[PDB]
Amino acid sequence: LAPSVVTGVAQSSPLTIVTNPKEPRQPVPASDGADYLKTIPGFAVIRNGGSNGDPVLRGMFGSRLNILTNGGMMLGAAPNRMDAPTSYISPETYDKLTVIKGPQTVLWGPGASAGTILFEREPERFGELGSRVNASLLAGSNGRFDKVLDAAAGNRLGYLRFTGNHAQSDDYEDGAGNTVPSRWKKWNGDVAVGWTPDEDTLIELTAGKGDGEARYAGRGMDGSQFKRESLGLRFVKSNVSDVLEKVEAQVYYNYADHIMDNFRLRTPDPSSMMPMPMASQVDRRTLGGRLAATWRWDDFKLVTGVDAMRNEHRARGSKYDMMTDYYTDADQFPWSKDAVFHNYGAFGELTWFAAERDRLIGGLRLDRASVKDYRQTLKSGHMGHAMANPTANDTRADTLPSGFVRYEHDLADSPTTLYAGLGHAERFPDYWELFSPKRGPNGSVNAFDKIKPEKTTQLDFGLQYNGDKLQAWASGYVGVVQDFILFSYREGMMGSSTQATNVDARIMGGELGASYQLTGNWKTDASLAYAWGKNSSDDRALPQIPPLEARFGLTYEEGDWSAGSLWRVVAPQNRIARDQGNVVGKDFDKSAGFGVFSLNGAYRVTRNVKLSAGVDNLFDKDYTEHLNKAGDAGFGFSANETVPEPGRTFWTKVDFSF
């Protein structure tokens, strides 16, 4: 019954990590989707500024991760990923966060090489008329203030539920004393009304908006706007027949509208290679749907379904004159669409409960993806001068089958699950893998033409030991990527020119962790995370792989309250690939190891209020992580200074529940 601050999260079941993102988290997370994953072993984040970092699972970056918000998928708009999907997520507003590791699900959408991440709000249910309400405030160093509110009323046959949050923090300072350009401010409000005419039927309509700004020490422009608007429509039925137990259909609509610029949160760099006032606006309209049936008879849980999605990128940029010096903002100019993706697919996943102690799971899905290039012309060929785009209105498509099988066995003597699984996923290229790179494979025409789908074939295995005093778990993976999409960086005349290529990679790695109850109120727990990758085409290492990392926790509990400390130690990373990486990160230098210590405590003052506090980086260590971006230079950043992590940090949080 003793309340605690989360420092790490175990596998609850094979390949599956399920956590509730409203409980306090030790390295206190900026109010975005990424940082709520730092506690999950296996996840590193690329630091861009103070918030809105880009998650990386087992070294795999970007769209190899399937990030969903109530089954619907929010997509960014920026050509350099300043609005990564998790920019628009505030995990504190959802009731559950689930992670599935490796390519071991077909239910939630296509091409999930690395894993699947699910934030969901769960349906309210009401006896008679009643109302619940949760709220929490968090105050901390450097102007950190996060309010958050959920509230729902309803009765037997309906409900309406409001969730909202507002968070903001000022520039953090490192362990060395300097102020890091890393300001931010965010909010979200979502409403949901739901109808339940009888206990076997549910419909819910959802609407929400959100906005945010964020200063970026690593990127050459800041985020002036992260406007999001959503509309959702769920429908479920239970116990249709006696072998058809659930039918769910849902339609989502997510619109992102984002302005990056260099004069609202920063003044334009004088020397630079861009001293103009400059802004660029980008939107992404997304419409998608899912439709699934669960059948159960005998020892068989079969889920069949089809899905579809369409999304639409548009852009427009500022134009600044250099003799009248009258700047015309972008929103006084027409929208110039340039990409439309589509996806339709169908899927099934069968689960066989053969015997008490053995389970057999297998999924397949067939996807029909396609994109059309509406860029009538391109910024290439000179000072970036216009040049007729050879793929103008060209359309690419492909049919792509994924699938997996996984066997889980429970030993008879000990409380042990052993599991092994083989999965193969194919992924149609990203918006960013197709339109962002300034050139495509050697002797291509552009990137949109020649960039192949990436097909990943991975073996997953591990165990769970969940007995009385000891709980342990371990997952490993070995896999091969064929046609890994990979960016190389040159510089000539104007800036770091990207070039996307298609290479084969070998990847292995694992994660394990354990938690031991020494006494009735003393607890300890450690976790370990290693990722490894090799570029087989060039016999190079893979770029942008997080180094080996270990966490150790120790906890004292007393029913009413708890305290804990936390040692995080990370090794250097001596496998690099200079000037290669992804659309976010170049790899440059070998990283330095480090360790960071942290203190936390929690107190249950009553049934409704519950307090929590912590100190992050107690010994004010000045460190940087391998995957962080480089600092701007127009921010006083040396040759290739990565962006420093935050120094000593104090935070306190109160959690209400009437």
Author numbering: 66 to 723
How did the manuscript describe this experimental structure?
Here, we show that Pseudomonas aeruginosa OprC is an outer membrane, TonB-dependent transporter that is conserved in many Proteobacteria and which mediates acquisition of both reduced and oxidised ionic copper via an unprecedented CxxxM-HxM metal binding site. As indicated by the successful structure solution, OprC contains a single bound copper and shows the typical fold of a TBDT, with a large 22-stranded β-barrel occluded by an N-terminal approximately 15 kDa plug domain that, like in other TBDTs, completely occludes the lumen of the barrel. The copper binding site comprises residues Cys143 and Met147 in the plug domain and His323 and Met325 in the barrel wall. The CxxxM-HxM configuration, which coordinates the copper in a tetrahedral manner, is highly unusual and has, to our knowledge, not been observed before in copper homeostasis proteins.
C143A has no bound copper even after incubation with 10 equivalents Cu(II), suggesting that this residue has a crucial role. While OprCWT and most single alanine mutants can be (partly) loaded via Cu(II) incubation, this is not the case for the C143A mutant. We hypothesised that removal of the cysteine could lead to much lower affinity for Cu(II), so that after SEC, nothing remains bound. To provide support for this, we determined the crystal structures of the OprC C143A mutant cocrystallised with Cu(II) or silver Ag(I). For each crystal, datasets were collected at 8,800 eV and 9,175 eV to distinguish between both metals. Bound copper is expected to give a strong anomalous peak only at 9,175 eV (which is above the copper K edge at 8,979 eV), while bound silver will give comparable peaks at both energies (the silver L-III edge is at 3,351 eV). For C143A cocrystallised with Cu(II), no anomalous peaks are visible at both energies, showing that Cu(II) binding is indeed abolished. All 4 residues in the OprC binding site contribute to copper binding, but not to the same extent and, in some cases, not equally for both copper redox states. This is illustrated by Cys143, which is essential for high-affinity Cu(II) binding but dispensable for Cu(I).
